[PDB]
A paper describes a structure:
Angiotensin-I converting enzyme ([name]) is an M2 clan zinc metalloprotease (EC3.4.15.1) located on the plasma membrane and in the extracellular milieu. [name] plays a crucial role in the renin-angiotensin system by converting angiotensin I to the potent vasoconstrictor angiotensin II, and in the kinin-kallikrein system by degrading bradykinin, a potent vasodilator. [name] is a 180 kDa heavily N-linked glycosylated type 1 transmembrane protein with two homologous catalytic domains residing at the N- and C-terminal ends ([name]-N and [name]-C) in its extracellular region. Soluble [name] has two homologous catalytic domains: sACE-N (amino acids 1–615) and sACE-C (amino acids 616–1202).
Soluble human [name] (sACE), which includes the entire extracellular region of [name], was expressed in HEK293F cells and purified from culture supernatant using an ion exchanger (Source Q) followed by size exclusion chromatography (Superdex S200). Ab initio reconstruction followed by heterogeneous refinement yielded a full sACE dimer map (214,893 particles), a map representing only the N/N dimer (268,471 particles), and 93,759 particles that mapped to an uninterpretable junk class. The remaining 88,930 particles mapped to a full-length sACE structure that was refined to 3.65 Å (sACE-3.65). Of these, ~268 K particles mapped to a dominant 2-domain class reconstructed as an sACE-N dimer, while ~21 K particles mapped to a minor 3-domain class containing two sACE-N and only one sACE-C, reminiscent of the recently published sACE cryo-EM structure. The remaining 89 K particles mapped to a full-length sACE dimer containing two sACE-N and two sACE-C, which was refined to 3.65 Å resolution. We refer to these [name] dimer structures by their resolutions, namely sACE-2.99, sACE-3.05, and sACE-3.15, along with the structure from data obtained using the Vitrobot, sACE-3.65. Based on the openness of the catalytic chamber, defined as the distance between the D1/3 a and D2/4 helices that gate access, we classified sACE-N into three conformational states: open (O), intermediate open (I), and closed (C); sACE-C is significantly less open than sACE-N in our structures and is only classified into intermediate (I) and closed (C) states. Our sACE-2.99 and sACE-3.65 structures are globally similar, both contain sACE-N domains in the open and intermediate states and sACE-C domains in the closed and intermediate states. As we observed substantial particle damage in our Vitrobot-prepared dataset, we thought it unwise to utilize that dataset for in-depth analysis and therefore, we focus on the larger and higher-resolution dataset collected at NCCAT below.
Numbering used by the authors:
A (entry chain A): 2 to 298
B (entry chain B): 299 to 625
C (entry chain A): 430 to 494
Write the structure that this text describes.
């Protein structure tokens, strides 16, 4: 790879612009091939595509390592002072080597760990104690049952089964990944991975501001929770839910209580007024694939 | 006289004429407290305590005499420089000396014990007896002051008092309430230091600091042996160094004074790790032999109601009494 | 009921992840910290009993990936 190695630029403005342009071109090629590999991974064929994604990530990370080392050794004394926001932002983006600080063995271990995490989460499945021939998955089946059924026992079975089958074989991998990411981002210059993640928003009082926002928004969620708790108590009785206390996780709409939209069946107030839907329009005029996109146009 | 041996505490005679060290023979005076009130007045001090014959009372007497060392030493400083550096120093310096007294070697060499019981079994017994109150308290103090910080700073609104308190208890100390509580109860109030305005992290800081003080003094005491029987008795240089440290009360940051004495400006648990080394090794061997988890593999476990309806609490369920009744 | 019921979860997941990364959550308080956070912020009680063996964050897709 000729574009992998950067030339001998200078800390001056012209050298900085040349470095920025060279990075622009090289990264254009790198993310072009990366997006090609990632898109081909999850369209028709998955065999020999996860491995291709891993090698592409490895080579892109090596490219980032080399370019970040060059950027460090060529701009570190003048990194803070640049008199140009664009130059500061681009040099900060390039300087963040990220997961390239680990040695070769550690880098391979970290990439393999990420791939193992993704595959373990994707292929995880849960089904019945008997007739264990074929059974459900996460999105095609589990979401449908957990969002459409109204039986407490079956909801509990689905929720517990998925949570066990997707959390139990995932703990040691997460421990190792946390250790590796902490080491890499400590060598980067940040106090920890969480500090780097907060560094995107660029605010020293990020946690305080978020806590203030949530304390402002608390009454809304408290009232909504009380109303939904009363509705669920009416539906399921005063044995699986009490008025004073929390709500069981599966009783809500989605699997992880992310959204309650599926609970609107037995929460809606004043049901005499008709619900809002335009399915009849699709029944009248066909909406095959593009009508909802020409409407966006 | 133990103080004076290492050229320490030239006790003024006013204590032997105007300080009460006894139980109140007449009058409804103080029953029993744990303070050493100083006359101050730029000149003198005093002790107000109780007198008994038990070794615990002797240890408490040594503790409060160590408290009196502090006052005797920091009086030339102004009226605002009376608290001794870190607020946890007063217990620490008042306790490290006790750590020297309670050693059987000290009792034997001062004439209280016939001979030194140089036995490993006795060593482990005494170490576990003392580690049942200088270690089980370590999660506490930290727990209480963390909860109080949370409530003060706003992270614990009045709708979450007991929730935060009991989550902290199950986290650090690992003790769950036998009765299922809720937010109406205020379980932090049972402790005396919560309603009364009293900081509670000073005791944790002292329980960490006293063993570091013991290790530093022992290293300067010339005895490079076990940390158990390493009393400061008959160590003029150790007394001189302790006097030098005690000379300044809050006149300098506590980190600087600690660096001056021990050798570093930050708290370390390493001397505490070395102190409890044999009991820790024996504990590890016992835990491995018994084959049990180290701790907390299953939480959300609350004990079932023992038929706590208050009609059978008076029923006795002791093994020894049952066997005696059987016989 | 689509947005407000989500807001605490958004404030919750990455707070737990920060706790795990920064070291305040050793690999013996994963599930405990997660479920305490759930009962504190979202007011959600896990139905079945959960020990430290379970990892009730890998169910969410954004935790493993
Ligand atoms: C990432 O995962 C790979 C692939 O293994 C797959 O994912 C794991 C998390 C498990 O669920 C595996 O069952 C699953 O196939 C791991 O590489 C694998 O390493 C092992 C150990 O060298 C290889 O052989 C195994 O060894 C023993 C017996 O010797 C048994 O566990 C198995 O029967 C098997 O023979 C295994 O072939 C290999 N798989 C490859 C290279 O594709 C890898 O260790 C893991 N990475 C990390 C960091 O955990
Ligand atoms: C999907 O629906 C679209 C939108 O109706 C179809 O596109 C039009 O189809 C009509 C059918 O009468 C034709 O007269 C138009 O010429 C088509 N184009 C446009 C721009 O309006 C489309 O054929 C349908 N099928 C597919 C496969 O896209
Ligand atoms: C009590 O017995 C212990 C052994 O259980 C003695 O251990 C001493 O340990 C120090 C550690 O630095 C060694 O330097 C000594 O040589 C050991 N003494 C021995 C082996 O006799 C300890 O000295 C004993 N204490 C008393 C007061 O006799
Ligand atoms: C952990 O919690 C589970 C329930 O979530 C407890 O129940 C057993 O879980 C194991 C898997 O860890 C299953 O194989 C058993 O069938 C479950 N039931 C019984 C009766 O054993 C499990 O005991 C808990 N473990 C710990 C160590 O607390
Ligand atoms: C607890 O049970 C043990 C074992 O059963 C008791 O020990 C025996 O008690 C019986 C009572 O009839 C005696 O006949 C045996 O000789 C005892 N065996 C011994 C002492 O080895 C024991 O007494 C019971 N009580 C306690 C407090 O342990
Ligand atoms: C950059 O300098 C190095 C010094 O070793 C030299 O080998 C290399 O050819 C130079 N590259 C360019 C593009 O001038
Ligand atoms: C940073 O750069 C500016 C550019 O105007 C300059 O004035 C300032 O002295 C520099 N600060 C340094 C070099 O510390």
């Amino acid at each position: 790879d000729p574009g992998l190695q950067p030339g001998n630029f200078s800390a001056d403005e012209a050298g900085a612009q040349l470095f920025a342009q060279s990075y622009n071109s090289s990264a254009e090629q790198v993310l072009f091939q990366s997006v090609a590999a990632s898109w081909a991974h999850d369209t028709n064929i998955t065999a020999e595509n996860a491995r291709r994604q891993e090698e592409a990530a490895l080579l892109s990370q090596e490219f980032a390592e080399a370019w970040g080392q060059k950027a460090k050794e060529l701009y570190e004394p003048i990194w803070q002072n640049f008199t140009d926001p664009q130059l500061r932002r681009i040099i900060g983006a390039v300087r963040t080597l990220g997961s390239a600080n680990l040695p070769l063995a550690k880098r391979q271990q970290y990439n393999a760990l990420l791939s193992n995490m993704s595959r373990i989460y994707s292929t995880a499945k849960v089904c019945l104690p008997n007739k264990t021939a074929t059974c459900w998955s996460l999105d095609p089946d589990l979401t449908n049952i957990l969002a459409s059924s109204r039986s407490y026992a079956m909801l509990l079975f689905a929720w517990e089964g998925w949570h066990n089958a997707a959390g139990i074989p995932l703990k040691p991998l997460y421990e190792d990944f946390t250790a590796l990411s902490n080491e890499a981002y400590k060598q980067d210059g940040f106090t920890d991975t969480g500090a780097y993640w907060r560094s995107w928003y660029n605010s020293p009082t990020f946690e305080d501001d978020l806590e203030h926002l949530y304390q402002q928004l608390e009454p809304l969620y408290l009232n909504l929770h009380a109303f939904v708790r009363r509705a669920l108590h009416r539906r399921y009785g005063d044995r699986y839910i009490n008025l004073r206390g929390p709500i069981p996780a599966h009783l809500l709409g989605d699997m992880w209580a992310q959204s309650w939209e599926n609970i609107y069946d037995m929460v809606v107030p004043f049901p005499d007024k008709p619900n809002l839907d335009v399915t009849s329009t699709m029944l009248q005029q066909g909406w095959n694939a593009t009508h909802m996109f020409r409407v966006a146009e | 006289e133990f103080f004076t041996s290492l050229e320490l505490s030239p006790m003024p005679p006013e204590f032997w004429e105007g300080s009460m060290l006894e139980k109140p023979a007449d009058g409804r005076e103080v029953v029993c407290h744990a303070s050493a009130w100083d006359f101050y007045n730029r000149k003198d001090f005093r002790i107000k305590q109780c007198t008994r014959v038990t070794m615990d009372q002797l240890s408490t007497v040594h503790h409060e005499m160590g408290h009196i060392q502090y006052y005797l030493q920091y009086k030339d400083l102004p009226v605002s420089l009376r608290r001794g550096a870190n607020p946890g120093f007063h217990e620490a310096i008042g306790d490290v000396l006790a750590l020297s007294v309670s050693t059987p070697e000290h009792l034997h060499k001062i004439g209280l014990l016939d001979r030194v019981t140089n036995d490993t079994e006795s060593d482990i017994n005494y170490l576990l007896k003392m580690a049942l109150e200088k270690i089980a308290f370590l999660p506490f103090g930290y727990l209480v002051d963390q909860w109080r910080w949370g409530v003060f700073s706003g992270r614990t609104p009045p709708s979450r008092y007991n929730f935060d308190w009991w989550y902290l208890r199950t986290k650090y100390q690992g003790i769950c309430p036998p009765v299922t509580r809720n937010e109406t109860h205020f379980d932090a109030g049972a402790k005396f230091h919560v309603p009364n305005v009293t900081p509670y992290i000073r005791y944790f800081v002292s329980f960490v600091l006293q063993f570091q003080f013991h290790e530093a003094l022992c290293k300067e005491a010339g005895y490079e042996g076990p940390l158990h029987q390493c009393d400061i008795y008959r160590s003029t240089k150790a007394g001189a160094k302790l006097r030098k440290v005690l000379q300044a009360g809050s006149s300098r940051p506590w980190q600087e004074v600690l660096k001056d004495m021990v050798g570093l400006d930050a708290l370390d648990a390493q001397p505490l790790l070395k102190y409890f080394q044999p009991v820790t090794q024996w504990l590890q061997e016992q835990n491995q032999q018994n084959g049990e988890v180290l701790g907390w593999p299953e939480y959300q476990w609350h004990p079932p109601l023992p038929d706590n309806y208050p009609e059978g609490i008076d029923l006795v369920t002791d093994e020894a009494e049952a066997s005696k009744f059987v016989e």
